[PDB]
Design an enzyme around this catalytic site. Structure first.
Site, short mmCIF file in Angstrom:
data_model
loop_
_atom_site.label_atom_id
_atom_site.label_comp_id
_atom_site.label_asym_id
_atom_site.label_seq_id
_atom_site.Cartn_x
_atom_site.Cartn_y
_atom_site.Cartn_z
N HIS B 78 0.97 -1.12 0.01
CA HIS B 78 0.08 0.03 0.05
C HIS B 78 1.03 1.18 -0.14
CE1 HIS B 78 -4.35 1.56 1.54
NE2 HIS B 78 -3.56 2.11 0.14
N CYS B 80 0.90 4.43 -0.75
CA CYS B 80 0.20 5.59 -0.35
C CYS B 80 0.88 5.80 1.25
CB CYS B 80 -1.15 5.71 -0.40
SG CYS B 80 -1.51 6.58 -1.83
N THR C 79 -6.45 8.12 -5.62
CA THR C 79 -5.64 7.09 -6.12
C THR C 79 -4.98 6.32 -4.97
OG1 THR C 79 -3.64 8.62 -5.84
CG2 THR C 79 -4.76 9.06 -7.71
N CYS C 80 -5.16 6.51 -3.74
CA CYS C 80 -4.85 5.68 -2.63
C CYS C 80 -5.79 4.56 -2.55
CB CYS C 80 -4.84 6.44 -1.49
SG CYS C 80 -3.47 7.54 -1.02
N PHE C 81 -6.75 4.53 -3.25
CA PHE C 81 -7.85 3.35 -3.19
C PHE C 81 -8.30 2.80 -4.65
CE2 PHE C 81 -7.78 5.62 1.09
CZ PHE C 81 -7.40 4.65 1.78
#
Lengths: 14, 106, 106
Positions: B78, B80, C79-81
């Site tokens: 992940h 981010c 964009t993190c998900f």
């Protein structure tokens, strides 16, 4: 916004 | 970007892992023995780039999260949040193999 | 990568969209006709990167959620998900135009 999941690290770095 | 001792000093844990987890101590035994290319490939997999931020790898505040018990699925990431999603593999040998296979795909 | 069929196979919908919504099927017609450059621009806009994950684009688990009614605002993303926020535009040509402007200027 996975805050879509219950991971504690997202709630710590959000 | 090869001082992984500075990376360990600031890494935290989630999903049930602590710094005293058997899986966690096996992990640090593995990555401390990584070559320079394997260290950069790990930083790219987990954070999105091999370049260390100014202030050292400690500013990454990496998290190692347990996402499940033993399995054949590879670890994920992940980027981010600089989070390694690490299943609780049943052996240090399996962990190294699954971790290497995951980070050499690039 | 460019395997956008696998991306479509695991995409989920929210906010009033389903796989049978008119704008959703128009979306997939548009991106399936995207050039290789536009596909990579779409990935970079929606996921933060144009590289495919280990296991193909199906592992992205993209979500298309409805973000308000028809408007001249551009679609956004988290964009993190891998979340695409898509207003319910009035036509396919408008959706194509708004989506191209969003991914080319970001």
């Amino acid at each position: 916004x996975x805050x879509x999941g219950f991971w504690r690290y997202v709630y710590q770095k959000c | 970007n090869l001082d992984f001792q500075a990376l360990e000093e600031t890494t935290e844990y989630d999903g049930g892992y602590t710094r005293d987890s058997v899986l966690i101590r096996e992990f640090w035994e593995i990555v401390h023995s990584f070559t320079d290319e394997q260290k950069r490939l790990f930083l790219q997999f987990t954070t999105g780039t091999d370049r260390a931020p100014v202030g050292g790898l400690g500013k990454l505040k990496m998290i190692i999260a347990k996402n499940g018990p033993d399995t054949e699925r590879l670890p994920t990431s992940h980027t981010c949040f600089n989070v390694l999603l690490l299943p609780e593999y049943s052996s240090k040998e399996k962990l190294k193999e699954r971790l290497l296979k995951a980070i050499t795909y690039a």
